[PDB]
Amino acid sequence: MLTRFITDVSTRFNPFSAKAKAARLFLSFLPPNARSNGMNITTQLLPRNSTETPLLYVKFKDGKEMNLDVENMGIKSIVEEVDRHSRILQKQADLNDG
Template structure:
């Protein structure tokens, strides 16, 4: 997964809920040095009895914001969506550099 174009990740999830699995997996797939490279990561843990649904918002360097529903997409779908936009930004950066 190309993460160098991600500037901010906001996640809200119940860590005990099965429905929040893909959100937790996405957060764990981010590189360990993401915060030191300038990425803002905000994770809000909901109480176990909460009825709120998990949410994941990813913001990119070009200003695009993606609100992703982990229950519907699953981890593969989330990574596909993020990678699709990251690859487009990578192509754009390659064209302007060379």
């Protein structure tokens, strides 16, 4: 996974809910230096009593704003759709580089 092109991600989920699994796994792949590099992140933890649908927000440095539901998609299904857009940005940069 590549987080270079990811600007900021906002996650709101309930930990006790088994559906929030992919939300937490995605949060781990982020490198250590993502914070100081300028990538804003805000994680909200929902109470155990009331359970709202998890929300996973993603946005790249090219205006693309991705929003994928966590209940339906698995962690393996989240990364591919993320790096997919991160793949075109790398080649587009090379095509424009030099």
